[PDB]
């Protein structure tokens, strides 16, 4: 199971808007573009695109610049669709790309946008029709249906998207196709004469998809004392912890269960 995903953010300024774009293979970033830069270009963020040709990066750059130009117009037109003023600032978000299942055939294709953080228009799983959140979004919908937009995007997602995803995965297999198991341990903190805290740690793992659950005598438990959002370590790996409050002497009842792709089998720890 893999994915290539692009994320664009166009933020209006009171002249040229700021256009930022990022691209990920799975949970690794490999490309960046920022209009607020001195001479904006496509910039690699992973070694397996650093040795691509200069033609490759010229082309990617040209398409980033064209998308920035287009997003200025888009912010204006959205301002028109919702009949908004011009003093306030707004945001256009775009996400598109392809997800391969474990087969590893195309599982899904994505082309969806957002205005002011709200769903705008999204290409459906069929890659043949559109979900518009608003009748205003249906202006765009009818524009695209008249132009057979879904057709072209199906051609890209089923075609060159999966091809360059597979090819990136190839040239970076030493990186992208090696899962790091979580290094795990448990900490303990007496709170009071009645309570203590167990905290189950998972560190240095890749990809970010992981499952941490506390059980009591073999029964999943929910109170807890927290489950924390999976966070980036800063070196390409991720972190997460799950903690629970327990009676101050019954720690042995409580086990921690870790599921991660890089583990040959789910792990069970305890303090």
């Amino acid at each position: 199971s893999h994915s290539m995903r692009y994320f664009d953010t166009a933020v209006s300024r009171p002249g040229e808007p700021r256009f930022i774009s990022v691209g990920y293979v799975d949970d690794t970033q490999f490309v960046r573009f920022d209009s607020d830069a001195a001479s904006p270009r496509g910039e690699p963020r992973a070694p397996w695109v650093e040795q691509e040709g200069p033609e490759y990066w010229d082309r990617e750059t040209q398409k980033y610049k064209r998308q920035a130009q287009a997003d200025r117009v888009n912010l204006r037109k959205l301002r028109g669709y919702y009949n908004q003023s011009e003093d306030g600032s707004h945001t256009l978000q775009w996400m598109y790309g392809c997800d391969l299942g474990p087969d590893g055939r195309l599982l899904r294709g994505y082309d969806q946008s957002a205005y002011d953080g709200k769903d705008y228009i999204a290409l459906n799983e069929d890659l043949r029709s559109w979900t518009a959140a608003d009748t205003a979004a249906q202006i765009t919908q009818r524009k695209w249906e008249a132009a057979r937009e879904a057709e072209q995007w199906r051609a890209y997602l089923e075609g060159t998207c999966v091809e360059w995803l597979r090819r990136y995965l190839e040239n970076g297999k030493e990186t992208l196709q090696r899962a790091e198991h979580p290094k795990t341990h448990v900490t303990h903190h007496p709170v009071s004469d009645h309570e203590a805290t167990l905290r189950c740690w998972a560190l240095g793992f890749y990809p970010a998809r992981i499952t941490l659950t506390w059980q009591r005598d073999g029964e999943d438990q929910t109170q807890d004392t927290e489950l924390v959002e999976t966070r980036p370590a800063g070196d390409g790996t991720f972190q997460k912890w799950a903690a629970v409050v327990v009676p101050s002497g019954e720690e042995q009842r409580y086990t921690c269960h870790v599921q991660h792709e890089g583990l040959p089998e789910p792990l069970t720890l305890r303090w």
């Binding site: 692009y6 664009d8 691209g23 398409k63 287009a70 946008s113 228009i121 072209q152």
Partner: peptide, 9 residues
């Protein structure tokens, strides 16, 4: 690789 098509509303 980015698609040759731009988002256009």
């Amino acid at each position: 690789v980015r698609s040759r098509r731009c988002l256009r509303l």
